[PDB]
């Protein structure tokens, strides 16, 4: 479909409807007392261009699967973008008023409870991930004609996670992506680094693969032609513009970001924007080719049920990609991510059977993880990144963002706690379960058996928000039979006796670790409950206190983890103040260091040696 | 001091020593039956060159504050590091075999117990940030002529940190500061994505203002000569390099990432390697010159007592720029950075006041810590770094791994909770709890009004581990004396009768709405006693059983935190089995939305009024 080049009035029309976008996001900031609005005026020609010129989605359906995609990235922008979906006519003008109001869902940065939004973007430097998994979607799996667009600060280009993403479109050949740098020289408290040193601008992204092109940011003109020109590669629009643009005063000033106008200059300014406006007659959106296919919604199944069997030695970690492998040839929905660690993780085995749907991310974690949502987005797929549950640390971020957007994404971190061995401190994952359990929308998936794997796989796949599975690196004996039903929130007692002394809690390698404390026991003659968690969070409260209440009150918790925020605390705060009821915890409690799996389980405190000490104090 | 341009038996000697470095890299890994020999042997020439021709450093002093600094930031490549110091004379040879073992102290990632090691690098992408801290503090701080060289990976260069660390540099102009690229087309799973494309990471790291330069890097005469010229401007040393370099057959090759030879192969390999080399003499290491200055060491004390008074209103956020520029008064060991937040966490005080010793580090946390870790190794400064807490898990792996690294860093983290109000969730720390106390050397300090911000700034600076500050945006009273003595690990009761029903334990904003609860219930005679932790990390357990006994044994806990991780899961597991003790919770339990600070109180049940009905249940 060929470029329309506009007429003057076009282009006047333009530039009047970015004037209004000016006003608003002054109006509605004011009104606030709070906001940025200088942040948003120097991106309302490229606002304008975007929605009233290039773009093409349904103004009445903005989730609609064929339109277009746009990423604000400088989410601190909000005011603009739901002004431009009012001047479209999804939004009432008046509404745009109550921005930041407890009352209204224009909240003070974009997220999904608006129609408009598909990923939270407070956090800067997270949207340009997004979008590229957006344009990976649209390119690889819908094989649609929708384009993603993605608008950034300046400052915020000093994140690493964006260059991640740059690197990563280009690798991938997104020509259905575009960036929007809105290089107006400042940042928050001081300049950006490079100022208006466009040609900087320029080399970085082409030494990146990009598409670069200069241009006037405050010409709709320019705006017009380069967004109109596609693209065989991602392009990046790096439009030099002024912060404040269009506020005389103020444009091009230091201390003034995230400052509201006071009522008096707003509407002495605004009266001057208003002045420049010559016509009130809005633009009307234009809608997209509807060729993105349906999606099927259904509850994704395995084809059969696990086929281990019971005494055969299997890590849950190969467990894990045994089971996503599985999974894939039930439903096309399903695709794996990693970072360079897919032969650590096993996810090579899904890319092995299911190359098609596999992302090789390199090691780029923060990135994977944008990916991922973004590829979730308008539910296109059921994504599943792994890597080692240490480095999803270097995700944090866009973890946290990932729940503030509402997404559904799995994530498998393997190679937790000191049983992985000789590597050390910085491949084990002990502070996972601390992380994960804090993000709200999270399940978290403890998998201490090859059958109870592939059942957390299965159920993740069907459960929405940040699913979280942590496999481990020792063989470890299958004890659950195939047919054993798994749900979450339901812990299973592997080992119960009618003269049971102590609850002992355990998962992954510290389940076998208890189960071998009680043979050790059973010389004594104590005996002790064996209850696997199965899911950490939520946690079986009522199984755990049924335990304790046959076990004399007694819990011992034994985790492969810190002590703060994992399984030990999880329970302790489950059950506190329960009548009768005791909990002693067993963690590890520093930095360990290399050493074979069982002699650093032994170092720090976690092995069978210990449980069976612990469980003797207790009964004394 | 002139270049030395070495003779033809000089390259030979290194050419020796390369040989030698892969020898033992293969000895020690088959001995292990662990580690990354192929990616010793990338590096080998690398590593001659720099320890045996171009470094100056004491031999058996490596921490010696004169030598040049060495950061692996390819940790997996730590037993050709060990084998560089048995050749340096500092370690005896035959350690060299005991890589790994829990007996030794040879892990498989280096970690600072290695007299050799400032920083643990074993999470790849983080070397290089902490090499700019210590190259910056080496060119403004020590104005010492020692002299920062970091080897880095390929497929590391994928990691957005690495990104942030060029522009660091560039930007700070450390031209005493070289990163030395080890190109040998591979990763762990697949190559890297550039491969051999010389040119591409030449334009790369140009575009980020760095001299890059191209060399063979199996060419000791090349590297002696690109490592001789210094260098205006922070230098790459980009080497194209093949994996495995010298092992017949293995050489170039995929599969073989992290994979130690069999016995046999290394067998046959080192008596091919071994035949290679003209002479077992060993070159010496040549010493620095000594104009690092001297250090104190002593206790940094504030200049004077808090000069607040009981009744103003001051934010925790204001008070810790106050303190900070206060104790910068008191110490020039003291330095600041922040992430362009400066006008918002209040650092910009300290800038105003002591500018030579705040770094800007721009939107760009994680290259933020690791400058601040980088700073602080071998005792050299006391940093200080700030930004919002909910911006701090974009670091929690250079936090993670700065514990791992032994680290003395301070961060404070504002904007905690809904109580910033109207920007929204993307900007409220609801997990900062949770990831600090999940780091084994931290202290997690929460003061609650600005004496006790005062008083925890000063404690933090002669704190040793991870000290995090939490500040907070609402302006709250004074309520402590300004002589009030603080500790760490010690709680204070901030009401109390004899007739108290309930101990409320608050903290900052909660802590205030806790005591307008008591208020509300004085009209219902009711008496509530109100404990500030102060320190979260460690908590002070017994004041708050002691407090407990005298309140029927009832604590209920109230924090603007999400459930997980948090004050009241620390405070139930601190006290779960104590007779007679029950904890009831009050947290926020989703994802928040903006209003109001009020409103989000209210709304997310933490208010003086949600805290009032739950001292009722109780009693109830
Ligand atoms: C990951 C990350 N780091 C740092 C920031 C902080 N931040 C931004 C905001 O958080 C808005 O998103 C900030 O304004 C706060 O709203 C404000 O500090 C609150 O102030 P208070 O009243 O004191 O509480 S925006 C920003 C600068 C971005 O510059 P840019 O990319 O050049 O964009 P421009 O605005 O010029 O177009 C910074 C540092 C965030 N959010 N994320
Ligand atoms: C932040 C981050 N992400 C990913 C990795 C994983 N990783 C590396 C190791 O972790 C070593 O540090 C990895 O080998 C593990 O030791 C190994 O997977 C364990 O295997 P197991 O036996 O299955 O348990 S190293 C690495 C590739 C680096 O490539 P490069 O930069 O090109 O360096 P080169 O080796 O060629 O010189 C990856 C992905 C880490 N560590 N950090
Ligand atoms: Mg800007
Ligand atoms: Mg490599
Ligand atoms: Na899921
Ligand atoms: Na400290």
New binding site residues.
């Given amino acids: 479909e060929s470029y329309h080049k506009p007429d003057q009035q076009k282009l006047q029309a333009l530039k009047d409807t970015a004037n209004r976008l000016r006003i608003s996001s002054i109006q509605a900031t004011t009104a606030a007392g ?1 906001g ?1 609005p ?2 948003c005026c ?2 309302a020609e490229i606002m304008a261009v975007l929605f009233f010129h290039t773009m093409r989605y349904k103004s009445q359906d903005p989730r609609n699967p064929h339109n277009d995609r746009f990423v604000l990235s ?4 909000a005011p603009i973008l739901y002004a431009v979906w009012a001047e479209a006519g999804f939004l009432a003008e008046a509404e745009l008023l109550n921005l930041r109001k407890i009352s209204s869902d224009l909240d ?2 974009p997220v999904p409870k608006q129609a408009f939004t598909d990923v939270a973007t ?5 949207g340009l991930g997004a979008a590229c998994g957006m344009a990976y979607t649209g390119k690889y799996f819908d094989k649609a004609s929708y384009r993603v667009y993605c608008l ?6 000093s ?1 690493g996670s964006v260059w991640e993403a740059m690197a990563f479109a280009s690798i991938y050949k997104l020509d259905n992506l575009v960036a929007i740098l ?1 290089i ?1 020289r ?4 001081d300049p ?1 680094p490079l100022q208006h040193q466009m040609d900087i601008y320029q080399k970085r992204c082409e030494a990146f693969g990009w598409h670069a092109i200069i241009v006037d940011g405050h010409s709709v003109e320019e705006l017009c032609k380069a967004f109109g020109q596609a693209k065989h590669q991602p392009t990046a629009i790096i439009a030099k513009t002024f ?1 404040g643009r269009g506020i005389t005063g103020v444009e091009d000033k230091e201390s003034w ?2 400052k509201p106008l006071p009522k008096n200059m707003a509407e002495q300014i605004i009266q001057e924007i208003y002045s420049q406006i010559q016509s009130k007659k809005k633009i009307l959106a234009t809608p997209p080719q509807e060729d993105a296919p349906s999606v099927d919604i259904a509850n994704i199944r395995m084809p059969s049920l696990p086929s281990y069997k019971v005494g055969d030695k299997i890590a849950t970690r190969k467990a894990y990609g045994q089971a996503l492998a599985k999974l894939g040839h039930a439903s096309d929905r399903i695709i794996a991510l990693d970072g360079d660690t897919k032969n650590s993780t096993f996810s090579e085995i899904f890319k092995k059977e299911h190359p098609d749907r596999f992302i090789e991310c390199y090691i780029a974690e923060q990135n994977m993880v944008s990916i991922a949502v973004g590829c979730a987005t308008r539910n296109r797929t059921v994504p599943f990144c792994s890597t080692f549950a240490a480095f999803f640390t270097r995700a944090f ?1 866009q973890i946290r963002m990932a729940a503030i957007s509402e997404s559904n994404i799995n994530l498998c971190g393997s190679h937790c706690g000191v049983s992985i061995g000789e590597d050390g401190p910085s491949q084990m994952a002990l502070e996972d379960l601390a992380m994960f359990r804090s993000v709200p929308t999270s399940t978290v998936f403890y998998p201490s058996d090859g059958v109870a794997t592939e059942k957390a796989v299965e159920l993740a796949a069907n459960t929405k928000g940040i699913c979280f599975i942590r496999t481990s690196r020792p063989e470890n004996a299958i004890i659950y039979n195939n047919n054993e039903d798994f749900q979450v929130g339901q812990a299973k007692v592997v080992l119960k006796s009618k003269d049971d002394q102590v609850t002992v809690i355990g998962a992954g390698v510290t389940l076998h670790e208890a189960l071998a404390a009680a043979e050790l026991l059973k010389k004594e003659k104590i005996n002790i409950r064996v209850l696997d968690p199965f899911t950490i969070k939520p946690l079986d409260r009522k199984l755990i206190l049924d335990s304790a209440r046959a076990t004399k009150g007694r819990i011992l918790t034994v985790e492969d983890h810190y002590y703060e925020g994992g399984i030990g605390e999880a329970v302790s705060s489950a059950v506190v103040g329960e009548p009768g009821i005791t909990v002693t915890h067993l963690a590890v409690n520093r930095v360990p260091r290399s050493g074979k799996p069982a002699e650093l389980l032994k170092m720090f405190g976690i092995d069978r040696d210990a449980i069976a000490q612990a469980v003797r104090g207790l009964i004394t």
Same sequence: chains 1, 2.
């Fill in positions: 709070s940025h200088t942040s120097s991106a400088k989410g601190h922008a003070g940065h407070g956090s800067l430097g997270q950034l600060g300046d400052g915020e280009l994140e809105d107006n400042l940042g928050q408290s950006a912060k970001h995230g971020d």
